[PDB]
């Protein structure tokens, strides 16, 4: 096979989280690409070599290393400070560095099985015929091969419209050609939901129940880049999405992937690829931050991403690879920020679109530099 | 008995819920006020006379006559328009009018029990050793009370903070003093729960099966102004608070009783009285409203309640009757507005509760010119 | 000479102002385009037939007209209205109808002069050795050349950073060839000036006393839209921005043609044409408006323009003609709202320059749709 | 006369400021209470030892002493930090030490005169019969008082409503008692004016030529602390007002001793109180600051001041002394901010006039304490 695999993780820690996450990689020889911040502390880097020194194949750019790299490739100011966003800089090195497969992942999560790696490289074993899951209301809820506690969930970036009428959707299993390219591996104890959804009932993923399911074409089903493997080939399209711009005067955050996660499915479909969803599944403990502030971070996309998500299934896209594609979209975008009519759309959530619209673009640019 | 009960009601319709809602007021003789807005159409007062020559003691007193009765009291500006905050004229006009019993609802409410106007009689009864609720938490849930699908939910206004301990909380029941002032009745079918328990899980309520409870001094639970009767005496302090106050410049809406429902409470428990929760039970059918739009509202209020609510239990009231203690626990929001600390607490959420005080003591001092 | 010339004018008052606009427009065979909104009253329609009677050609499609041409052009939510940004119709409409002048115009604006149009005409003379006016600083300021008390005032628009050292620059006039494009013709009364300035001193303009100048490669002064011709091969670089975007929160307004003077201005530069300033010269009485309310609306843009203006003079453009300049311009702020910094450049602060750039991508699309 | 004199001056710079104010306040005797803040370095404190061994009485308390102090006066949380409202901490310790006179001042602001300290000795006068000077508008303009090119300006805080009539209106000198309590010493170089009229004149002023004056009951001006001497018993009324509040989004700043400028004098024409203005002279320099950030800073209180001065001029005060009278004011205040109407009259503007008014009333409670 001889396939690369490199792990993209972002963080502010002191680097503890290698202590159980580096076996899972070290084994399968693939590289752990570490893309530290401003604030973080020297023990990150003291901790990276000692787990090179154990056999791990990591990389831990300081941020002097990162901005010289982006002011090489004319992108000084596309990527901020203090904002988990850095996570591109991993996005672009394992790309420019000729990996195969890019496993983005968050450092709180830690693998359950020891074949982590070797189930994300699903993501490169070609188009062949094989069964492929579509549903009558064009959305998958991937919580649904999840066993959960008290009550179902739906994951974050899930639309809200069409919730309450999903029960009733009609799931169909049918023998199709599909091409998977992203992988996005479930999650057990704390799910990855929304702010509001943690909020009302608190859920527990107990354990992973469904096995694993490849979305046809029309399916769509939110991804996130806590668990998820790209093929180098849609990279492109995986650009996480600037947060901060402000929704009716109250900045967005929290929704980077969400944007992601659906940007380059959109794009997927258009090229006749796949998303997959189940193994291989991470334990993401709970962790105690004010559910509050994650609510008010949320609602701002929340109240605009039905709308985003209405429009694009409307608007065809063009493109031969992804880099084509994702600069389609962003001008889509653009017009689907003029077309879309609603309480949420003020004169600042359509300037979001615009905006993110000319960052997407300055993200394909600086790949075509490197390439 | 002679136990005169007064039904307050706010409404922009054209007064077609009359036709279910009045066969349970005439029966018991009591009278119901309903209060139009500038947006209420003509079809109201013709509905109102027709139900009155069936023998319906129904009055709808016009906004020139609303208009003119606050400004014969010194308060022309402290009712705003288009926003259900007038009903508070309704309930000026009931205690106005010497009404032992209000009776506050929605105008979408049915009773669903011929002694719908009995049972709310209840806040008339006086002190009386009887069996009270306690929790070692200080918070009891009176969704509990009913039977919901498809998990458990707390009602609109519980503290977000005290949700996941509640479920280890003991409940204790004991025979003591109390005497019942304010009964907060339930509701089948959509509960009123807060909008994050709405969107996550869409709450059904089949029945009512945990009886009714009276809570002890300590132990709190929020009283909407849906289906709730309160008691002449305690009226002064059940003013529905004006909405529209910006947090981090986001207009607060929703939660207009929310904070009367606590205000009342804590009153009632300074001067010895208690709070009812349980029948009747009235019919909330699931209206069709933009839930994300009702999101945007509660956000700002649900922000700020967990530490008003914590600071209100270290604060001490004065006063000898509700006049009294209501305009005591004005003076103390607004040591607590300087007192608190948060991420939440701008300088406009802390000037709410100072214009929010300012308010409740005009609302008071119209109630000390007509007395 | 057979020069065509098409005033365009957008109202919504009940056109009194074509009593005393109608002669020097009608003596001299031009068009008028008046272009109504939704608040525009049954009174405006009735007073540009009796003109037309009178022998004044002049035009006034109702809002319905409008928007069947705009949606032709596939630009139906390009204009907004409520807002004088509909003028945009009557560049349009005079554009498509092949006028070689269009002559931009409020409605409080009257002609002094009977040579009105025949002054406005300079900008179809052509190219021609001729004095141009050359500033060391980079900086004209038009109202020198006007009498003005009790003080000197700068325009709307002016650098507020290169004010303070203005006096002390060196203007020069040089022979050198020169194509004028863009003529701003002056105005007596209530000048041009931002509501800082009329807050301050409120000048009034007694008499045009410098006469006119033609503005040499790197001299700029700003150009409004009040009395202001430009020849048919500009008005694709001549798009009235669309304002309501917030900066800070703050939405701004009232600086729609200073965007549009500055950005026809530096696409005539780059193609090898000129702006010039003076004759014809207008009255504009002093209007009647809360000051203060204007200068809330300014402020964020005040606050945005000097940087603007200063990334302008380093940005290179590109193209041809005044579309593919235009264009290019458009692509150039959306760099300048990446590399920019300072305190007043919030997250929507620079996506108001996105948005912008993509809505001058849609005027440019819409008449390269009519050619 | 035995008069104790107290310069109250709050600073984060390095104490330089303190050689060239030494000498004015050392041969008068006078005592210099330097507050610095969180932002100052430990410079000051040396330049406060240097000049207390030269013979000047200055005082430099550390934010611990000061913290400690507003804590056992039940106020921890009035005076915020990294703000310039820390001079209130200046005001509340000369009080308590029993100084006559207290002059407010900026650190860059330096006496021109030998009789600095003499000159603001004029508030401890006494009653007297003196040539006070009226208006037929009710205002009058201190900076008719200097030489100011290039043209007439109006101070900082002058509402500007008044300003286009005030050339017209009639000012008129009687011999009538008064009793001066506030004296208000004006400034050459760079006179106090908004960032409206720095921004549109930039005014120099030259000279002192007016004279002073004693302004009769009715006729107001703006008082500034930044040279500006109050009696010991209307210091509870000069109370320095806290900044920061939204005004529809837009925190307010720069206002704070134009509120209290007015407060104060207010307060004091009800006690049959007098303002003074003109010597003694300082010299302000022409300081280093955005202009446009001020203006950012000053439009949200500019908005609002018109309404709130006209609105004292009809509601009467109650009380005996500076004490009472300021807390009917702050009362006052609060009954205005819900008569008041206007476009900029937000829910925020209206609850900005609340926590004032608390915040008054915490600085007079503090007061009450120490008394
Ligand atoms: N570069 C960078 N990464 C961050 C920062 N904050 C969080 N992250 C990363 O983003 C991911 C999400 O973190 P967070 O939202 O705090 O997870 P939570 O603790 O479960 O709420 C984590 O895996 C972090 O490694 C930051 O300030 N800079
Ligand atoms: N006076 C007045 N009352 C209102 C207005 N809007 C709603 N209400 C009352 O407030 C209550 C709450 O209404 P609403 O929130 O719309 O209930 P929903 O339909 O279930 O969402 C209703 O019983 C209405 O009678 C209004 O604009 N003016
Ligand atoms: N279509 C349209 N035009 C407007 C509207 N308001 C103003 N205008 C035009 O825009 C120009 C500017 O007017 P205005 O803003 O009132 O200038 P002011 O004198 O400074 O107040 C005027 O000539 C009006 O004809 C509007 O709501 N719609
Ligand atoms: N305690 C404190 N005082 C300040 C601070 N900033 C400014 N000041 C004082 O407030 C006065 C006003 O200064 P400033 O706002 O810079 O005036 P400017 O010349 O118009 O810029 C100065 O005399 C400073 O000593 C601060 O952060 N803390």
Known sequence: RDISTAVVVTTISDGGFLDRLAPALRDAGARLIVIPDRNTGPALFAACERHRRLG?????????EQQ???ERLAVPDLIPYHSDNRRNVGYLMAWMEG?????????????????????????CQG?????????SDGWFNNCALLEVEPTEVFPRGFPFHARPAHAQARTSVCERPADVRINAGLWLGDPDVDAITRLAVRPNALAHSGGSVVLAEGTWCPVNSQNTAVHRDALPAYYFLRMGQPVDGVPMERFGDIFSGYFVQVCAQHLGHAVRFGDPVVEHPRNEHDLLDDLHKEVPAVRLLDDILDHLRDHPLEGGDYLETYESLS?????????????????????????????????????RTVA
Do not use: K
């Open 56 to 64: 791990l194949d990591v990389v831990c750019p300081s941020v002097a």
């Open 68 to 70: 010289d790299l982006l």
């Open 99 to 123: 990996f195969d497969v890019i496993v983005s992942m968050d450092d709180d999560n830690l693998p359950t099985t020891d074949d982590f790696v070797e189930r994300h490289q699903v993501v």
């Open 127 to 135: 188009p062949r015929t094989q069964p492929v899951t579509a549903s």
């Open 331 to 367: 001008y889509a975008l653009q017009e689907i920020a003029e077309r879309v009519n609603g309480r949420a759309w003020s004169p600042d959530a359509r300037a979001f679109l615009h905006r993110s619209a000319h960052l997407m673009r300055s993200w394909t640019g600086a790949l």
